[PDB]
Amino acid sequence: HHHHHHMVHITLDRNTANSWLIISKDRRQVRMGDTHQNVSDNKERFSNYPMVLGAQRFSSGKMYWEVDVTQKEAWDLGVCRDSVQRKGQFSLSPENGFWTIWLWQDSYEAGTSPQTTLHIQVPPCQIGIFVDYEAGVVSFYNITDHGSLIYTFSECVFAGPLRPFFNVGFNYSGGNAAPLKLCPL
Template sequence: MASSRSVACVSRLAGRTVSFVSASPKKSVLWPARRQFITSTGNSLQFRLDERTAHSSLDLFKKDTGVIYRVLGLDPSHVQANPERFRDWAVVFGDEKITGGRHYWEVTVKKSQEFRVGVAEALMSRDDCVGTDGSSWVFGYAQRKWFAMTNNKIVPVTLVGKADRVGVLLDFEAGVLGLVDIEKRRVVHAIRNHFKTPLCPAFGLWDGELLTHSGLEEPEGLEG
């Protein structure tokens, strides 16, 4: 990829850990006229993973609520061409577009040592990876450590270990994205931003699998 600014993030591509350089300035995706999203402004967000956005190394399963990483994946030439599909990074979006409200969902992690969970603008460039630009906000796990990431800036998260299941709390109007320790019922870290455009649940995966759980109510007594 051509580059205009270096980045410090490390990610995994095609089964190998590599340092990368971001794509050239942020680009928008022009959707086909037929594309439609469900829009959510309430509190019980229900979504599935959107195959049309999934990188060719990702397979969806369990009625599109789970995703598994394939080391080799599919030959990109054998995947249906779609401007919504991530081209270089193992990322997939949820099929819900969020324009307001307070929402909560959970993610079960299986056999993964490198993943990211969070939200991104629906029109985020499909040449970028979630967390590396100013249109995505994620919590990630790599090298046995948690971190928060946006615009390629990494902030360590030290109050949570390698959990098999974590929660994500989004308050659109308050501009808060929180990582939730389910057992302790507390937000262990929050990313704050003034969200201006519709958001989608976003996931990056470079080994193992993730299973999403949506349509959930926020846990009672959640602190932080």
Template sequence: MASPGVFARVPRLAGKTVSFLSAGHTQKSVLWLAGRQFITSTENSLQFRLDERTAHSSLDLFKKDTGVIYRMLGLDPSHVQDNPERFRDWAVVFADEKITGGRHYWEVTVKKSQEFRVGVAEALMSRDDCVGTSASSWVFGYAQRKWFAMTNNKMVPVTLVGKADRMGILLDFEAGLLGLVDIEKPRIVHAMRGRFKTPLCPAFGLWDGELLTHSGLTEPEGLK
């Protein structure tokens, strides 16, 4: 299985929740937890697992399908259940939820990996492509000790000091925004713009190590 490389074909209220009405009377909640303040709308809460039906044969799912590990040799593709949703040439896996609107936030923990991609892709994206190489996917990637944003096979460097072991992803469907979030600040390190018209899936590419997803989270307060 080919690796894409950089130029791929490549007041202190711990534990308390306070509800209020936002403009437009949508009920939201503010949660204080371990010194971090979050804000969320319950109607936009996104909970997902990874979809084994989409996983390339070199990827194994674990921890109740919330994590994925790369196997260098992987499985013989002929031994994997054949279905049209599975990625055939690239080590990519989608989440099992389709997003058609709203503002959503999730986080990713990466271990022992020097090459990965995280972001979103159209649910019907070609399974012969890699996330980031087509106009139907938007991702943040890490390779050769550098971060980049990528869509339609075009890369933009992302200035980020060192390699983060855990990062956040913010998606605002209507605004056409995908943000890479430094969860320690918290702040958006880099934002991508797109025209999201069809259902999107959280998408992940992994070429070594392992990756664990954290969904159903509240959005850190102050992200624009």
């Protein structure tokens, strides 16, 4: 892929984070804490899952960023509507305003309803996410495997401003503490 030149500088929005997350000073890394991180509750925070949004809002154009997923057993990545539900249980689906992929129990899947099996030959250490707002496209690329395509959502009905979306996953196993990191341009 030759999407690199629509590169945008993404930072994380502390105010949207689940109360157990730790966001780095530079707002480019997030990880699961071992407790409540001593923040007040607010209506923006994802309550049930270890999720956080990027600060940037997109309503036009083409945008590209990269995320490091090294050493993690579980995570979700992609974009979502600014209007997504924050409290209680919900599925990741385009009907609920999410365009995502994930790793879970040694398989990769796209967040369709129902979920779609992904075919990845080289487990990725870094993921590229490309959004074309006008075309209605969200695509995922395997940076570890020369940028090979992972998945394309097309005919997307965004229905509002989009935000970068992150889930660091639970760490019941003790093998998923590693952070998600926004990679430099």
